[PDB]
Every structure is written in C-alpha cells, then in structure tokens.
Automatic annotation (TrEMBL), chain A:
This is EF-hand domain-containing protein. It comes from the Eukaryota. Transmembrane segments: none annotated. Residues 6-41, 109-137 form the EF-hand domain. The chain holds residues 177 to 351 of 352 of the full protein.
UniProtKB/TrEMBL annotation, chain B:
Coiled coil: none annotated. The chain holds residues 490 to 538 of 635 of the full protein. It comes from the Eukaryota. It is found in: Cytoplasm, Cytoskeleton, Flagellum axoneme. The lineage of its organism: Eukaryota, Viridiplantae, Chlorophyta, core chlorophytes, Chlorophyceae. It comes from Chlamydomonas reinhardtii. This is RIB72 protein.
Length: 161, 46, 426, 427, 426, 427
C-alpha cells in the first residue's frame, strides 16, 4: 500500500474483508490462499511453522490479529483494525493507571514496614499518620487516586506488595 | 577543590511530567533531579 | 573513525550548543549523568564521532565552548547535560568584548586565541582521523562573531585539509537587537568568504515566523528556537552517525552543493514542523514532507527563494523510507516548478536516506538549498553598512583600537563582488 | 571452475549482500557458515563444515561495512575480506582515484591476489559498482587499472549502475559517469548496464509494488546475476561459460555496453492470473516494459543477444519462437550480423527468497542485449555533461583535489568519438 | 641489594624528606610505629634499599638529617612518622648560619662536617654494596646549601665511584624569598658542576603555577608542594623498589641522559596531575598520559622547553601498560614536534615501565627531560649576580668571614662557560 | 644429542622464561619438575622423578632473576644455575665487558663446564641476548670469547634481538650494537637477527592485539625456537640438526646473519576463517608481512633459505611450492647460488599455550633466510652511529670506565668493511 486515500481497504483485503463472520480465526489452507493472493508465496513446510508458533494446539485455526501487528507499522495497523478509541474517558483511565503505577513505585520499597506498623495500630486519618511516619507523604489527592483501590489495611498493603 | 550547580527552573519528576512541589521537601527526604538524587540533610531555621 | 569537534562562540553560541548537545545526547541515549542507558546497540557504534570514553562509559562531548562573560558559562552549567562537560574545555576569558568586533578580533583575541588554539589542538590530536570541525556562532555579538572569526582563520591556516562547518545567525532589521549589527556582520562575512568551507545562514525573523505560522506557540522563548536549529544540526550530522540505504557525509554534501568556491552560503529548512493541534490531522508520507520542505514559509532565512533561482538543493531523510518515492518526489518538484531552477545545471537535487528516525518521530527531513535569493539579504545588509559608513557613525570606537579604514573598504568591496557574482549566476 | 566477485561502492556491497544471501539459500548453507560441490565456484570449504565466499567487499565509509559485519551473516563473510577505508571519496572521482585510492588499492590488490592464490580454476573476476558515486568510480577505476596490469587477459564482468536521465540521486553524477567511462572503456572487458528507473517501472508495473525500497531492487538484480551464473554454478542442457561473452556480444573491443533484461517478472497472484508458457516470455523479455535500463529499443537496432533460460525448458519451442522473432519485423537488427542470437539452457529453476516478490517460477529468462539505444543514452549523458561543463561548475573541487582541465576535456572528446563510433556502426 | 642512603639539609629539605619518608612508608605499608601492616609480599623483598631491620621486624629509614636550628627538629618530630628515625642520625648543630653560605661552608661546617661524615660513613659501612646517595636541599639558603655543598665534596673525594642524586630548589625573581639568593645559588652551582653526579632542578614558581592550573587548589600550603616533589622522588626510585618489564636503575638513567660530563641539570614533570573535580571526566590511557607529560606547563622549572631544544628525554611509567603503545607514542611525539629535539642524536627518548603503580592511582608517569632551556634560568640569576657584584652590595659579611673575591670571579666564569656551552649545543 | 641454552640480559631471561615454559608443557612435565627420551636434549633426569633444564640464567641485577626464583618454576629451575650479579652494567659495553665481567664470567664458565661434563653428545650452545643492552652485550661478548677459546669447534647459536630504527628503547644502543658486532663478528658461528618492529607489525596485523606487551612477543619468539629445535627433539620425515646450518646458511665465514620468519601467525577466529594449506604459508613466509626483521627483502637479494615445517605435511606440495616460487620472479636470488633452499619436516605440530594468543594450527613453517637487507640495516645503524660519534657524544662514560677511541675507530671501519663485503657479494 504505497500511497492513496483508499489503501486501508487493500489492507482490509488481507483477511477482514473476506472473512464473513466469526472471531479472528482462519483455517490453514485459507490462510495460504489469502497470502499467495497478496504475493507471499509461502511453502507449506514453512507455513506449518507459523501455526506452530502461533497455535500450540491441534486446532488449525489462527488468530490473525496477533500476527498482522508485526507485519504492519503501529501507525498503519489501526487502519486495518478499523476501531481505535480516542475518547477522553479512555485517556483519563490511562491517567489513573499512570498515577496508581507511580504510587506503587513510591510505596513499594517501604510497603513491608507499613504492614508491621499498621498491625501495631484502621482509620484513614490513622493511615495518614502511619504513612507519614514510615516516610511517604500521604495526601488528599493520593486518597482520591486510591479511592477505587480500597474501601482494609491488610488488602491495602497486599495490593501495594 | 570545588559554584552554581543547578540554575533556577522547574523540576519535573523522573518519568511522569509532574513537578516537585513544596509538599515533598522534608529533612531525610530524597528528591530525584535529572537522573540524580539528593537527600535533604539539614533545613534552614526560617 | 570519522571525527567531528564542536566549537561554540558567544552567548547565542553557548545556548545553541547546549540544546544541541541535549538532543544528540538523548539521541545516543546517554543520561545527564554521563552514562549509557539506551537499548539499541546501533547507538553504541557511532558515539566516538562526538564523545570520548573517560571512566566506565563516561562519554564527554568533544566540544570547546568559548565566551567572555561568566553568566554565559553559568547559563551553560544550568540545564540538563550541563555537568557532562569537562571543565578543562571550559576555556573562558574575563574581560568581555560586548558587541565589539574589534575587541573580539584584535585585543582580546591576542590573549585568548593561544588558550583556545591549545585546547582545540589537544581535542583534535586526541583522535586520529578528523572528518571536520563545527562552529556555531552569531554575527551580531562581538565575542561570537569576532573571536570565532579569528578562530576560524587560525584553524584554517593550521589545518586546511579538514572539513569545516559554520552555523551563523545573521541579524535582520525586522528582528534588530543592537545597532552595530552591520559593522559586525559585514566584517565577519568578509572573513567568511575566504576562510569558511561552507555556512548555513540562519535568522530569528524566519524562526519567529515559522513558530507563529506552523508551531503557533504563543510565547516562543529562545529555548524552542534553539530546539529548531538543533533539529537542523542533528539532521545534517545524523547520516554520519547512523547507517542508511544511501549515505552522504559532510564532504559530499559540500562537493554536491558547491559549484563555485565563493558561493558557500546556504538556507535551511526542517520538516516536519506542525502544531500539536494539527499533528492529529496530518498524513505521514513523502509528499506530505515535500510540500512542507519546499514551501517558502519554512526556510530559516529572510530570503524568498521564489524571487530568484535555486542553484542546487539537497534533502536528508530520516526513517525507514522508500527510495523510489523519494527520487520520484524529487523529480516531481524538479519538473513542476521548472522556473525556479537554474538552467545550465540539470538534476539540481541531492538526496540521502538514513534508516534511523529522530526520537519521538517516525519520518523527517532537513533541507539545504543553495540559491541566489540570499543576495537579497546581503544587499539589504550592505545598504545599511554604507548608510552608516558614509557619515562615519560609531566609527571612533573601532578606529581608536587598531582598525583602519581599508578594512571597511575591503569588506564593502568583497560584499559587492559576492552579490555581483550572485546576481551574475542568477 | 571458480569465479570471485568484488564489490566497489555503497551500492555494490548492498548488491553483494543480496546475491550471497541468495547463493547460500540456493546451495542450502545456513547463515552460520555450514550446511546442516556446486558451491565450489563461489565457496571454499575451510576446515570441515565451513564455506567461505570468494568475495571482496570494499568501501570508504565503514558504517555500511560494519553493518555487514554486525548483520546476520557475521560468520559466512569472514571478517578480513571486507576492506574498509576511513573516510569517503564523497562523490568525487578525483578523491577516489588519487586521494585514498593510493592507500587502499594496494591492500585490495594483494588481498585479491592471495584470494586468487586460493583459487585454482579462476575464469574471471566480476565487479559490482555504480558510476555515480565517488568510491565506486574513482578507486574502482584505479583498482580496474591495477587489476588490468596485474592480469589483463582475464575477464572482469562490470555490472555498472548508471544514473537515470530524469531520476537522479546526486548532482555531479554526470561528471562522475563521464570520468568513470573515460577509464571504463579500456578497463572492463564485459560491462552490463543497469539503470534504476527501469527497475522502478518493472516493480511498478509487473510487480505492482507502489512503495519499494532498494532491497527489492537488489533482490531482482541478484536474480539476474544468479541467472547468469547458473551456468557456472550448475550444469544445463545447453551451457555457456564466461569466456564466450567476449566472442558473441563484443564485435569491436570498445562497444561493450550491455543492457540486461529479465522475464518473467511476475508476482504470486499473477502466477495464478496467468498460465505460464515459453512464447509469451520470449516476447516479454524484449519490450522496454521489462528491461533494466530506461531507454527505447524501437529507436535503435540490436547488435547481439544472449538468452539464458532456467527451469524446464525444451530447445524446440525456443528455436521456433526465435524463428518467429526473426520473421517478425517489429524489431530490426543491424545489417552486419545475420545471426545475432545465442541461447543457453539450465535445468535448475531460479529459487525464491524468503518473502520474495517473485513466485516459484517454472521457467525464467535473462536477456543480455547490445544496441544503439545505449548510444542515445550516452548522448543524453554527454549533453547534460556539457550543460554543466560550459560554465565550469564543480570543476574547482577536482582541481582542489589536484586534477586539471586536461582530463575533463579529454573525457569530453573521448565520448564525442564514442558517439561518432556508435553512429558509424549503427548505419 | 642495591642501597640508597638519604641526606636532608636545611628546613626545606627536612620537611621534604619528612613528606618523602611518609609517602614511601605508605608505599610499603609501614605504620608510624615501624611495624608491617601491608598485605602483598611484593612490598617485602625490596625494603632493604631504604631500610634496616633493627629489632624483630622493626624498620628504620636509612636517612641522616642535618641542619642548624632546633625548630626544624621539632617540626620533624611533631608530625606523624616522625618518630621512626634513629636519634643517632639526628646529627645537628646549635648556633645557625642563617642564609650565609660562607658560614655554612667555612665556620659551622668546619666542626659539624666531621661528625656528619662519621654518621654517613657508619650508615654506608652498614650495608654491602652502595648504589647511590640522595641529598635534598635548596640553593637559596646557606645552611642547607653550604653545608650540603661541603658534604657533597667530602663524599665525592671519599667515595667517587657511587651514584649520587641531589634535589635542589633554585630561587626565581618571581618567587624571591631571601636577598642573597644569587650569592648563594651561584656559589652552590659552582660546586655542583664539579662534584655532584647529576641534579634535579626544582622551582616553587612552577609549583605554584601547577597548583593553580592543573590542581586548582585554594590554599597550597608547603605540605602539598612537598607532596608533589616527594611523588617525583618516589617515581624516580620506583624501578629499584619494584620489578618491571623494562628496568632502568639510577646509573642506567644517568648514563642515558648525560651526553657530556658537565650537562647534568634536568627539569622534571610528573603525571597524572588533575583537579579532583576533573578526575571524573578523564580517561586513563598512555596518550592522555603523554599529552600531559610533554605539556610545557607541567615542567617543574621556570624554563620553557619550547624556548630551546630538547637534548634527551626520559619517561618512567608505573602500572601494567602496553610497551608497544609506549614506543609508538614516543615515536609520534618525536616525529611531530621534531624541531624541539636535537638534530645530531636520533631517538632522543628513553622509556621504561614498572608493573607497580602508586597507591591510589592506576597508572602514573615521571618525565625527566634534558633540554637546553635551563640556560635561561642560569642567565636569569647570573645577571642579578653581576648586578650586585658590580658595586659590591652585601659583600662584607662574606668578605669579613674569610671568603674573598676570586671565588666569585670563579663562580661567574664557571657559570659563563656553562651557559655559553648550552648555547653552543643549542 | 644435547644442546645447552644460556640467557644473557634482561630480555634473555624473560625469553627463556617463555621457552622452558613452552618446553615443559610440550613434554608433559608439570612445573614441580616431574612427569606424571625426547626430553634428553634439554632435560637431565635429576635423581629420578625430576628433570632439570640444561639452562643458565645470568644477569647483573637481582630483580628479574629472583622474580623467577619466587615465580611458579621455583622447583623446575634449580636454584644454583640462576647466576646473579650485584649491580648492573647499565647499558655500558665497557662496564659490561671489562668492569663486572671479570668477576662474573669465570663463575659462568665453570658452571657451564660441569654442565657440559654432565652432557655427553653436545651438539652446541645457544645464547639469548639483545645487543641494545649493556649486560647482554658486554659480558655476553666476553663469555663468547672465552667460550670460543674453550671449544671453538662447536656450534654456538646467537639469537640476538636488534634495536629497530624508528622504534627505540635506549639511547646508546648504537654504540652497544657496534661494539657487540665487533666481537660476534668472529665469535658466534650461526647468528639469527630478530628486530622488534616487525614483531610489532605482526601483532598489530595478524594477531590483531591493539595493546600488546612483551609476553606475547616472547611467546612467538619461543615458538620460533621450539620450531627450530623440534627437528632434534622429535623424529620427522626430514629432520635437520644444529650442525648443518654452517654448511647451508653460511657461504662466508663473516656473513652469518639470518633473517627469520614464521607462518602461519593465526588468531583463534582466523583459524575458523582460513583453510590452511602449504602453498599460501609458503608465500606468506616470504612477504614482509610475516618476517621478524623490519626490512625490505624486495630491496634485498636472497642467498640461502631454510624452511622447517611442523605438523602434517607431505613433501609433494613443498616441492611444488618451491618450484612455483623459483619460476616466479617477484623475489630474485643471488647469481652465485642455483639452489638456495633447504626444507625440513617434523611430525609433531606446535602446541598451543594456556592464555597464549595462538590457535590450534595443523601445520607451521619457520623461515630462516639470508639477504642483503641486513646490508641495508647495517648501513642504517652505521650512519646513525656516525652521527652521535661525530661530536664525541656519550664517549666519556666508556673512557671513564677505561676504554679508548681506538676500538670505536676500528669497529667503525670494520663495519665499513662489513658494508664493502655486503656490496661486493650483492653483485
Ligand atoms: N541499483 C541500485 N543502485 C544504488 C543503490 N544504492 C545506491 N545506488 C546508486 O549509487 C549511486 C551513488 O553511489 P553509492 O553506491 O550510493 O555510493 P558510492 O558508490 O560508495 O560513492 P560515495 O557516495 O561517494 O561514497 C546513486 O546514484 C545510486 O543510483 C542500490 O541499492 N541499488
Ligand atoms: N623481544 C624482547 N626484547 C626485549 C625485552 N625486554 C627488553 N628487550 C630489549 O632489550 C634491550 C635492552 O636490553 P635489556 O634486555 O632490556 O637489559 P640488559 O640486556 O640487561 O642491559 P641493561 O639494561 O644495561 O642491563 C632493548 O632495546 C629491548 O629491545 C622483551 O621483553 N622482549
Ligand atoms: N537563535 C538565537 N539567537 C540569539 C540567542 N541569543 C542571542 N541571539 C542573537 O544574537 C545576537 C546577539 O548575540 P550576542 O549575545 O551579543 O553574542 P555574544 O556577545 O558574542 O555572546 C542578537 O541578534 C540575538 O538575536 C539565542 O539564544 N538564540
Ligand atoms: N619546597 C619547599 N621549599 C621551601 C620550603 N620552605 C622554604 N622553601 C624554600 O627555601 C628557600 C629558603 O631557604 P632556607 O629555608 O633558608 O634554607 P634552609 O635554612 O637551609 O632550610 C625559600 O626561597 C623557599 O622557596 C618548603 O616547605 N618546601
Ligand atoms: Mg557511497
Ligand atoms: Mg638490562
């Protein structure tokens, strides 16, 4: 697909146009035909190696979404996929993941002593005193990020472990 | 042996695009600045 | 193997070099603490072209900074990668020229050029086979222009067989810092026309213009301007630092853009440059890069090329790109605007491709155009120089130091014959 | 039988990177260096279970050379043959022929000498180069100079890549091409021309690739080389060696500028869209829609032709098709040769490469022709050479290197005699 | 097996020797109580070259102090490692000459020199086969110079077949402490030219210059300067104390560096000397080492070698290094700066290597180059000598003691034929 | 068949430290001194269950010799052969030949006397020394004089290490070389010249170690010596002892200076690279890329050559190789020798050493030839000797020792006479 505003179809010609229904599963002879129509010219001996690496079963059906990703550029693969969510909500969940990951990086080193101190005690206000004593600054915005995490001090440290 | 080490500007966090605030400045605390890390040993009386 | 040394002159030279070292250090994955942390081993093979391993992967940039004011030096140790330089290379005076080409060329050079020539002699003979030297400086300031001028002359008489790059910003009337802009710029280019191998002419007016139109930032500090010219410098030296399907070094870019040894001033253009609001709506193809590279609103000089003729041009591409579409797009732009190209030179385009894109991007390009539109700016400068020199404004601060009148007349004559030969080849 | 291949310039070593990849998968030798007699013409069996190619990559920019050393064929190409300089000639025939060549041609020629000492039945050398660049032109010329005083009588197949008329990568490539030909006329014995836009036309039309890189180019060119070396790598029903190219394709010792053509260039979907035979490929190998040099053969007259075949080929259908070609009038031969054809048959079909754009073909044709269309080409080169020569553009670089105007003038007038010679033999 | 005895004269010499014995004892792991505290047995086999095992593993430094003021002795005993000397070698007068060469050569020596000769005779008979004697002093004072002078003469006429080193600091007009420095230095060197085997010329001016530029200290006390020169003395004796792949003893170095029996004054350089801040941005390789070696600012005298011609040169290397890299580096530095070398002697560099670095550094080097630039400093001081002697200033204190004028005429004439023969060989 | 090895100088002991280390690991003798008939030429079976080298280490300074005494072969070498002085000659031929020699060489003689008494079938001696130093020159020459007056008839192999022209360690080494040559002119029977610069080019190019030390140098030297003595150590198809080198390499009783070379100098990966046969190394032995002396045999004319081969070599190919070398004209012989070659072969291959930078090589070649390149080398050192001698530089040390101007003058004109001899035989 060199250059046009219609090339994503010629890419759609690979599987997703000619697969009438079902999930991403393709039989082995059909995969050979869909390949040689595009110019791959795969030999069956090499062809079964593809099924060996991408299907450790005797099913003979193949999840092409996992294989075409490496055949495609990460920018052009979205055209073949057809659906990619650019929504504000998805972005905000990514933000929450990043914040939670960051908090886990902060508390991870001192997660072990926090368990001994909490058992030495649990209220939220008491968690602030405990967390500030062990050496992590616990704030209101930290609580707003950790609100979907708990409410449990035991599962709190467990999920931080 | 032995200066102005860092000239004044904002300091973002290592990977995230978040700036250190005064909420992170305490004795004993450590701050990561430009792949370096400094401990705050002693604080001013003021 | 091939070696490039860096030289920075003046405040603008230091800040440009600081941001430029930032970008290439991130390009080779080395941290501001001076250690490698990247992943691809391809970064490891061509770091000797700018670095020297000191202690356990400690790579100091092969650079020499030069100034006369400490605040410049403080501003250098400021940002990231300010503590990756060896302070011995921080060769630095104390008095200060202060927008005085004469002080930067006669008085302070007498006691500074020995030290800098000493350290560059160390920094050059440290490595075996130099490819060339690099000089970033200005044409408005004194220590940048004047002292860099004396430096370029001294290294050319010492080592004339090595290549030599010179990136200079030229002052413009629409972006006017100081008053002695012409008295400096005319004398400096009068030395450039015989000493420098080739130069890339820059200007801040075109930078602000490009930032407002394309980038549309609302407060473009000097930082992103340094970011732009750094993207230029990184583009002109990336082909040496990374293998490609067709590579081209400093020397053949020179031999392929210099038809006559006096016409060694080029205009530059970097692509792609789009605002983040418009990043989302743009394609990523070779004509998509070509339409912005050949656009006159993307040159980094104050000379409209459509007012004159393109003598020759060259394009350096970064990223895994297809060669057929590359050369066909070059043929296309060659043939559609068949008026803006010079007649007696068919195939006015040089092009090279490197397979490594810049970090954060997928595919980019840099442009180096040798055109006769630049004599517009030079005439615009010379007319200001004669407007002052006719009635001897500000002349005494120069004459009372050791400079005489024939220096002004030789500068004007060299100025007029170069614009004449530029008008001739137009 | 043995024949060794040296590669001069940035393009040539990429070509060799494709050819030897193809040769090893053709003889079933893994990139580690060993299989899990036909290889003897290209590989020497060192020790036990190790085959080294008889090759010399050489270049002045070490980046690409070291990329070969860090590629996947680290162990096949043994790390001493890949000769590299320190800095480029940089598109300068002068810098390539005098500046660095004097320091690298010696090491190159004593290395190939010792390589020839390993050889026993050497038929010839073959060079891969592009006359556009500086390294491939300058030191390539000097190597061909000192290689011709070394051996002289041995054939040195020059598969050269000329700049396209309207497609151009460089600017001084006319000057490089004139100065290289100025010594290529008296150095190479058998020189085959290979433009790039014609390849682009073929990949655009026959291969239906819209956005190709150099790899597919090198892949197909390697298949041309393998096709013309299948006679030495294997035995066929009708074999022809390397020494016969001087006897059939070169009637006068200076007109050796050969155009290569390959057919069928056919994609995998077109292998099913079309039922393959011989006669349609005999016709397909002649049209400029399948040649490797951008020109038009209808304006010129053919001099001599070499038809190589690989696969399941019976000489009866070829003889009948060449009969129809000699009766058909759409192509006209010169009046100085009644029979301007020479065929060659090989039993082994050309193998495919992994992910190759060409499918498993039953029969393939490699055509090597001579005509006056190359004479139109050189006139087209000389015109644009004189265009830039009138105002003395880029001359000071060669003078700064140390050259003068005498060699430029003598190169210009030598091609003027070349065009005159072509216009005399064309009548 | 080969032995060296040590002799310190005057306050400067005593403090220098104190620092010297401290650093060598550190090199051999001996604590200030005189017991073994090292780890490697390689430290054991070669301590007889400077020590005598007294009582069950108690090692005494084979040294003899000599001076005239008790304040010196107290300063020796106050510091660490100051109690390891045998008090029998603390031979010491009581009155003091006080920067009076005549007193230090005629009055006080006349009753002090017999005793010091006894103690050096005892310490020399205590060992088997002398290699050489070592004497440290200056050329400005009287007590160190004059008595050390007569001490050298008496030793020569007693043992004329053994090697001998004398480390003498010469005064400069830039670092000019006392007033009668020329009257002292001229007479002392007038004795050094006929008595000592060879001398190593030192200067405080160069010491101050190198702690400014290379070391960048703020307060360079005398301890640091003495630390510098002691590292030099440890470097020149390292070949005897430790095995190497190319050994060069004191006699071998002298016979290689002295072409004519009067030409035995050498300027010294030592590497690596980098600031503590710059110690991180540096590498450890022999060209890095060599470039700081041959630097004119690294010489420990106020005589620019680029102002004259190198007669010979010698390099002593410490650390397991590559000999092939050594000679090719020496080959290059002789081929490049070929004018600074003498013409009628090819291959003007002697090189040696030892597999034992100093403690704290991985690789070190000492440079001893015999140039003709030293005639500048001799002419520098002789013109002052003539200036004072033109009208007999400060003369009567020497005259009334017993010395007369013909000694001064002999001193200046010997200096004059000296300098003229440098100019002859220059 | 026995031969004794003595080592004179700082270089000699380290060289022997490589040689005997190589020998014991060649004959399977652990460093303790015992085995867990071929050794009978270098080892005497002391008592029983112990073997002593037939060796004499000698120096004036103790540091290197007692380093050997505290090394690993403290028991293999036996503690009375390691003769040590008390102070060095210090690069002074006078001090080494007259001052300290008169007290040390007597003990050396009476030690080697009883060693020769213990021996039965003495083939000869071999001395190791570098003529640049003082100890290796002075007392070595004095010892050789008294050894000649002792035996005279028995072969004494002088394996000398010359100073390179541009690569120099000392300063007065021209004086030392001149004075030492004046004695080895008439003292040693067969003497082999070995420079350091050719060795440095070898380890740079072939062995490709960028930062080498003397260990690798002495490793190859020892391998050269072992290759020269394996003929008497082990039986081969054509073995040659020490005696025949006078009748095959010495045409004139004063020209005994042989140029040594070895092949193949191959690293670990390059053995994987190259397929070793005999023709290529036979060529490789003659180019200056594998000689041990920095000289140009292209400027020289060969007089006589020896070629010891080790490993699995059949004579048919060495006859075919010498035949092709004789009909090749790249190397010209002297007009007074019609046949200037002598070959030799031993079955056992040269082994590898732990930590050594050599690979397991199937066969090896040791080349010992003679040329007039030494005739150039002597002029090169005679001239630079005359330079420093013209102004009486460094002469006062030797006269202070007790020598005079006569021996300088007579050795200078004698070496001049050496040149007129070289120029007369070269024609
Ligand atoms: N067919 C083909 N031609 C190529 C390829 N790469 C480069 N060329 C041609 O080679 C010409 C320039 O020579 P290069 O091989 O790229 O470089 P060079 O020959 O080493 O000369 P220098 O650039 O001066 O070092 C260009 O005009 C191209 O037409 C390739 O991959 N395939
Ligand atoms: N091949 C080789 N030559 C060496 C080695 N060490 C020293 N030499 C040579 O020996 C010469 C100097 O003599 P040395 O052996 O070092 O010392 P010496 O023979 O005892 O003579 P003196 O130094 O006076 O005691 C130098 O010119 C070197 O070329 C070595 O390890 N290998
Ligand atoms: N692009 C760019 N131009 C600058 C910068 N700083 C100064 N300049 C230009 O340089 C000129 C003045 O240079 P100056 O600071 O006097 O140089 P110096 O005195 O030699 O250090 C003015 O025309 C400015 O527009 C900078 O950071 N970036
Ligand atoms: N290197 C060094 N030189 C010194 C020191 N103290 C004094 N000097 C030098 O010695 C000179 C004076 O000599 P003086 O001390 O009177 O000699 P003394 O009385 O015999 O010890 C001055 O010019 C100083 O430069 C020291 O601690 N170290
Ligand atoms: Mg190229
Ligand atoms: Mg020695």
């Amino acid at each position: 697909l060199g250059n046009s505003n219609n090339n994503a179809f010629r890419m759609r010609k690979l599987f997703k146009m000619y697969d009438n229904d079902g999930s991403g599963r393709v039989h082995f002879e059909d995969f050979r035909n869909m390949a040689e129509t595009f110019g791959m010219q795969l030999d069956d001996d090499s062809l079964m190696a593809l099924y060996f690496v991408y299907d450790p079963e005797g099913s003979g059906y193949l999840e092409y979404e996992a294989l075409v990703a490496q055949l495609m550029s990460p920018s052009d693969f979205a055209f073949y996929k057809g659906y990619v969510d650019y929504s504000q909500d998805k972005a905000d969940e990514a933000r929450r993941v990043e914040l939670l990951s960051q908090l886990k990086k902060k508390i991870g080193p001192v997660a072990g002593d926090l368990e001994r101190l909490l058992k030495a005690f649990v209220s939220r206000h008491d968690l602030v005193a405990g967390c500030a004593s062990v050496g992590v600054v616990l704030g209101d915005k930290d609580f707003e990020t950790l609100a979907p995490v708990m409410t449990d001090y035991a599962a709190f440290c467990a999920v931080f472990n | 042996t032995g200066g102005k080490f860092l000239e004044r500007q904002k300091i973002y966090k290592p990977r995230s695009e978040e700036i250190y605030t005064y909420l992170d400045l305490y004795v004993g605390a450590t701050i990561e600045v430009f792949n370096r890390t400094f401990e705050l040993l002693e604080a001013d009386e003021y | 193997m091939r070696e490039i040394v860096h030289i920075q002159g003046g405040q603008c030279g230091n800040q440009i070099g600081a941001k430029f070292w930032e970008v290439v250090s991130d390009e080779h994955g080395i941290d501001p603490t001076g250690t490698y942390h990247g992943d691809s081993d391809l970064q490891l093979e061509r770091i000797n072209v700018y670095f020297n391993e000191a202690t356990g992967g400690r790579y100091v940039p092969r650079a020499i900074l030069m100034d006369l004011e400490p605040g410049t030096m403080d501003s250098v140790r400021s940002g990231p990668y300010g503590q990756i330089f060896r302070p011995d290379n921080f060769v630095f005076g104390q008095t200060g020229a202060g927008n005085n080409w004469a002080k930067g060329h006669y008085t302070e050079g007498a006691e500074l050029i020995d030290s800098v020539l000493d350290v560059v002699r160390k920094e050059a003979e440290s490595c075996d086979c130099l490819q060339g030297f690099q000089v970033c400086h200005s044409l408005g300031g004194g220590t940048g222009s004047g002292m860099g001028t004396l430096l370029i002359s001294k290294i050319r008489e010492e080592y004339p067989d090595r290549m030599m790059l010179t990136f200079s910003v030229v002052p413009s009337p629409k972006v006017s810092d100081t008053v002695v802009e012409p008295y400096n710029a005319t004398l400096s280019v009068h030395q450039l026309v015989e000493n420098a191998d080739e130069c890339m002419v820059l200007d801040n007016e075109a930078l602000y213009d490009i930032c407002f139109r394309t980038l549309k930032l609302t407060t473009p500090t000097f930082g992103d301007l340094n970011h732009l010219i750094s993207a230029v410098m990184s583009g002109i030296t990336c082909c040496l630092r990374f293998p490609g399907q067709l590579n081209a070094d400093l020397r053949k870019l020179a031999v392929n853009l210099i038809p006559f040894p006096r016409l060694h001033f080029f205009m530059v253009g970097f692509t792609p440059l789009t605002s983040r609001g418009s990043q989302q709506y743009r394609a990523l193809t070779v004509p998509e890069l070509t339409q912005q590279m050949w656009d006159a609103k993307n040159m980094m000089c104050a000379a409209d090329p459509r007012h004159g003729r393109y003598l020759t041009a060259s394009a350096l591409f970064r990223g895994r790109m297809s060669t057929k579409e590359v050369d066909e797009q070059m043929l296309n732009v060659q043939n559609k605007n068949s008026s803006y190209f010079v007649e007696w030179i068919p195939n006015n385009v040089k092009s090279s491709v490197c397979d490594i894109p810049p970090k954060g991007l997928k595919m980019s390009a840099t442009f180096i155009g040798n055109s006769t539109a630049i004599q517009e700016m030079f005439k615009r400068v010379s007319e200001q120089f004669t407007a002052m020199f006719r009635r001897k404004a500000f002349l005494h601060w120069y004459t009372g130091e050791g400079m005489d009148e024939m220096e002004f007349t030789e500068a004007e004559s060299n100025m007029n014959d170069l614009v004449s030969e530029y008008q001739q080849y137009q | 039988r043995e024949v060794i291949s040296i590669h001069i310039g940035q393009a040539g070593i990429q070509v060799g990177n494709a050819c030897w990849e193809l040769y090893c998968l053709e003889h079933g030798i893994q990139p580690d260096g060993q299989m899990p007699d036909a290889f003897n013409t290209f590989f020497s069996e060192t020790g036990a279970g190790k085959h080294v190619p008889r090759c010399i990559f050489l270049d002045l920019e070490p980046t690409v050379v070291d990329e070969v050393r860090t590629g996947t064929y680290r162990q096949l190409f043994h790390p001493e043959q890949l000769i590299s300089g320190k800095e480029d000639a940089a598109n300068n025939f002068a810098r390539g022929h005098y500046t660095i060549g004097k320091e690298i041609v010696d090491l190159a020629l004593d290395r190939i000498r010792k390589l020839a000492d390993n050889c026993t039945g050497l038929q010839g050398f073959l060079v891969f180069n592009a006359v556009g660049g500086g390294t491939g032109s300058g030191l390539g010329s000097l190597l061909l100079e000192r290689l011709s005083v070394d051996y002289g009588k041995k054939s040195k197949l020059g598969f050269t890549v000329y700049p396209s008329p309207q497609v151009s990568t460089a600017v001084v490539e006319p000057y490089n091409s004139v100065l290289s030909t100025h010594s290529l006329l008296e150095h190479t014995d058998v020189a085959v021309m290979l433009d790039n836009e014609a390849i682009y036309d073929i990949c655009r039309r026959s291969l239906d690739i819209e956005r190709p890189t150099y790899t597919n180019l090198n892949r197909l060119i390697a298949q041309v080389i393998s096709s013309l070396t299948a006679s030495l790598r294997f035995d066929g029903a009708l074999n022809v060696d390397i020494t016969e190219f001087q006897t059939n394709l070169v009637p006068y010792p200076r007109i050796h500028f050969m155009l290569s053509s390959y057919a069928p260039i056919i994609s995998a979907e077109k292998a099913y869209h079309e039922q393959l035979s011989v006669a349609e490929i005999t016709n397909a190998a002649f049209e400029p829609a399948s040649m490797m040099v951008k020109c038009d053969p209808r304006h010129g007259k053919y001099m001599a032709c070499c038809l190589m075949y690989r696969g399941d080929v019976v000489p009866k259908d070829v003889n009948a098709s060449v009969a129809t070609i000699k009766t058909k009038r759409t192509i006209q031969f010169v009046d100085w040769c009644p029979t301007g054809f020479k065929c060659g048959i090989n039993y082994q079909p050309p193998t495919v490469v992994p992910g190759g754009d060409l499918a498993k073909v039953q029969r393939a044709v490699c055509m090597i022709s001579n005509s006056t269309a190359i004479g139109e080409i050189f006139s087209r080169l000389d015109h644009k050479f004189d265009l830039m020569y009138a105002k003395r553009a880029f001359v000071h670089w060669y003078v700064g290197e140390g050259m003068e105007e005498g060699e430029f003038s003598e190169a210009r007038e030598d091609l003027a005699a070349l065009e005159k010679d072509f216009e005399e033999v064309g009548a």
